[PDB]
Design a protein around this nucleic acid. Structure first.
Length: 141
RNA sequence: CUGAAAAUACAGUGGGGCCACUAGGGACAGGAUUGGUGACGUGACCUGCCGUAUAGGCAG
């Protein structure tokens, strides 16, 4: 699964019709987040889900925050955001309601967010998830 | 399978001549628009060379 996801990162710049900060995640990686088995049960994460996210944590690690956009500025939708947090979709809308998670362009007053349109950056959606500590994080070892 | 079928309105043409709207004339007095407001930092326009030159030319 790592080597399958490694070629998509190396050949990310090849596929670009627009800039990284304007392109969606499913345009480069393709369905690999919303196909993943859900963690609605117990808050017990799937071994497929543990392996996917732990690759994305080292992606933003290798792609620091510079003035040129890179692979860590790909746009993520509210459903793909809901899976990466492992919570309900209303709970992730409520974080948007109290401006905890910051969209990536301003909707103009009658814009209610399309649930499939890529709203948030991959970047700080991960950093929000690393603000919550669970036992098998890479920080301790 | 119709108040059923069918159907060539046509040819020609001189509105013309004349004409005084005119005289007179006060729109005028009064007037409080007012309170309150962040254009940008997910962005390409960089790094150097020649030249006396904020002239003018150039390399990725």
């Amino acid at each position: 699964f790592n080597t399958e996801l490694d070629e998509l990162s190396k050949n990310a710049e090849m596929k670009l019709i627009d800039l990284f900060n304007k392109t969606e995640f499913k345009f480069i990686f393709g369905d690999a987040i919303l196909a993943c088995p859900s963690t609605q049960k117990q808050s017990e994460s799937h071994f497929i889900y543990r392996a996917l996210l732990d690759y994305l944590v080292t992606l933003v690690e290798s792609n620091p925050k510079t003035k040129k956009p890179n692979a860590a500025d790909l746009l993520v939708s509210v459903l793909e955001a809901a899976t990466l947090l492992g919570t309900s979709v209303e709970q992730v809308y409520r974080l948007y309601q109290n401006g905890i998670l910051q969209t990536a362009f301003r909707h103009k007053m009658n814009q209610r967010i399309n649930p499939y349109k890529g709203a948030f950056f991959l970047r700080h959606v991960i950093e929000y998830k690393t603000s919550f500590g669970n036992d098998k994080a890479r920080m301790y070892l």
